[PDB]
């Protein structure tokens, strides 16, 4: 022992690197990998293109007396995206599906400061050196919007001071009243509940459009334009011809 | 005149059954095949579906496909400030030969 270990530990990490580096085969490709087998390649989908862009802004200001006094203005957002990729030839063919998604800023706003929201205590560096085990990360360390019961619950079990490597926040000051700044309403970010369901690759089923007058309205207006040239082995048989009344009437051929 | 581009026409492949073509049989096909209505637009009455509009072509409905129209999910009542729609919604099917506007 300690040789089977220090090998199983190292060999385990190799297995972990295959499920994530080769998705849509988890818990099945590693099993075949250990025995020295492979999977059927042609069943899996694959990505063709991926484009992203940040919408520009143009400001149009009112000139009437009311607009000048109050300072009325409008924001217009637009963007253009296009790609050109080759189609992958297959014996049985396939379907190419395109998507167009508009999302707000993905930046946290409700998260206590790791240092200033906790007691100022002197760290024992020697003791922290002898710490190579997964420490708990309980709720109330990620956001202040936590119920009484959820505070003790463990969200994820990882890290030694991992909540201090990087801190990112974007939100309004707590002193400010959101009722104001309705003409400077530059706020559109995902207020995810957090804490509960830490693992989630899905947006909420109902994301309101705060900056827009109607939250249930479809804000965007997309215009698509696709052109495809597809060499195919289809016969594309001939083009018939119309009938001339003179023939079969005046007997030109007799 | 407005834009002369079709908007009501089923997709030749995605609007029909996915079947495997017999290339050998299609080689021995040099006769005018029927092109019945319901292959040109979805705005067809019950009786007109069986009627033959024109009698020509072997897979001629797949050489070129052109469409310009609003998404069926969208409600035309909206986009009254982006109303970029002006095209000829000809009845089609009936009177295929016509060099005259409505």
């Amino acid at each position: 022992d300690f040789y089977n270990a220090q090998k199983m530990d190292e060999l385990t990490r190799v297995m972990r690197k295959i499920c994530d580096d080769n998705p849509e085969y988890g818990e099945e490709m590693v099993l075949r990998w250990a025995h020295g087998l492979s999977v059927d390649p042609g069943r899996v989908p694959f990505l063709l293109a991926e484009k992203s862009v940040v919408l520009g802004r143009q400001i149009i200001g009112a000139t009437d007396t009311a607009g000048v006094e109050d300072g009325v203005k409008r924001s217009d957002m637009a963007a253009q995206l296009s790609f050109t990729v080759p189609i992958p030839t297959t014996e049985l063919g396939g379907i190419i599906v395109t998507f167009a998604c508009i999302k707000p800023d993905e930046t946290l706003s409700s998260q206590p400061h790791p240092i200033l929201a906790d007691h100022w205590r002197l760290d024992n560096f020697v003791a922290d050196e002898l710490a190579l085990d997964p420490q708990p990360v309980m709720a109330r360390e990620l956001d202040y919007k936590v119920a009484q019961a959820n505070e003790t619950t463990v969200v994820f079990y990882t890290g030694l001071n991992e909540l201090k490597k990087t801190y990112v926040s974007y939100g309004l000051c707590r002193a400010l009243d959101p009722n104001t700044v309705e003409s400077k309403n530059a706020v559109w970010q995902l207020e995810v509940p957090l804490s509960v369901t830490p693992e989630t690759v899905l947006y909420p089923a109902d994301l309101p459009q705060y900056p827009f007058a109607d939250q249930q309205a479809e804000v965007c207006t997309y215009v698509v334009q696709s052109t495809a040239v597809m060499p195919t082995p289809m016969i594309f048989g001939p083009s018939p011809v119309e009938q001339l009344a003179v023939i079969e009437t005046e007997d030109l051929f007799e | 005149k407005p834009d002369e581009t079709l908007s009501s026409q089923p997709h030749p492949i995605l609007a029909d059954h996915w079947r495997l073509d017999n290339f050998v049989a299609d080689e021995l096909a040099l006769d005018p095949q029927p092109v019945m209505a319901r292959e040109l637009d979805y705005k067809v009455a019950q009786a007109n579906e069986t009627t033959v509009v024109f009698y020509t072509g072997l897979n001629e409905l797949k050489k070129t496909y052109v469409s310009y129209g609003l998404c069926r999910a969208l409600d035309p009542n909206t986009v009254e400030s982006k109303n970029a729609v002006w095209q000829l919604e000809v009845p089609l099917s009936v009177t295929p030969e016509t060099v005259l506007y409505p």
Partner: peptide
């Protein structure tokens, strides 16, 4: 020669010509 008003325009490409069709094909060809 009884027309006394404007006329509708003429299509750039008819349906039959668009698909390269024909109303009544010939048997000889």
């Amino acid at each position: 020669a009884a027309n006394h008003s404007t006329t509708p325009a003429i299509l750039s490409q008819t349906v039959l010509d668009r698909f390269n069709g024909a109303l009544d094909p010939d048997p000889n060809v």
